[model samples]
Target: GQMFGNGKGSYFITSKDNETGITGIRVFVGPVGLIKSIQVRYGSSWSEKYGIPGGKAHELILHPGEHIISIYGRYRTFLQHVTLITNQGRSASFGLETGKGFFAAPNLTGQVLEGVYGQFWLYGITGIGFTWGF
Candidate 1:
């Protein structure tokens, strides 16, 4: 899988790769509008929470056979906002809409988001990266 992002911040984390497909996601957003933590579920497995855990948590569970096709987001010193769009036409969004914007998707045909990676700090997520593959 290829990686793409502004590539900013501290501690780094990456979700474990799984071919079963993404089943769900949970994002924690701070009152100050920064993304605090993120967790992803692949089939029955849940990835480790990335970033400090504190804030309002938003969750999205995909219907069976539905898979995320793209991710778009905004970020400054910390992640400001993120949205996920699925092949089934459903979508989920989190955090604030301000900051520099970014978009991520698979570059090859038949590929889908297999996992995620990025940097984090004590306060929030400082950067975000996507893992695209089968």
Candidate 2:
């Protein structure tokens, strides 16, 4: 799997890898403008939240056959914003748009986003990485 983002913070976390595809996503954004936590659902199973769970929650449930194609976000010391773009043209965005921007996608053809990994802490997510493959 290919990884992206700055990969900062202390604690490291990774989602369960599967070929069934991502079914949903929940992002928790802090009031101070950083991403607090994130959870991904793969084939009806929810992955562990990567960061401390305190913030406004935003969720997106994908339709059948829909899969994430790319991830866009901003980060400085911590992740400031994140947006998931799907193959069906739907997109879900969370957090404030600040700091250095990044785009994550699979380099190989036919590969899709399978899981997420990165670093986190008590405050917020310090970094984010996307797993791209079957």
Computed on alpha carbons, the lDDT of every model, listed in order, comes to 0.79, 0.80
Q: Residue-wise lDDT of candidate 2 within 87-128, one digit each (tens)?
A: 889998898898899898888867787777778865788877
Candidate 1 per-residue lDDT, tens place, 1-134, comes to 33333455665655545358678988999788888988898778777888888898898898887778999888877888899998888889998898788888788867777778788866888778887777
Candidate 1 TM-score versus the reference: 0.88
Candidate 1 residue runs with Cα over 4 Å from true position: 1-8, 16-19
Clashes of each: 0, 0
- Stretches of model 2 off by over 4 angstroms after superposition: 1-5, 16-19
For model 2, where is the 10-residue window of minimal lDDT?
A: 1-10
Instruction: Give candidate 2's root-mean-square deviation (CA, Å).
Output: 1.9
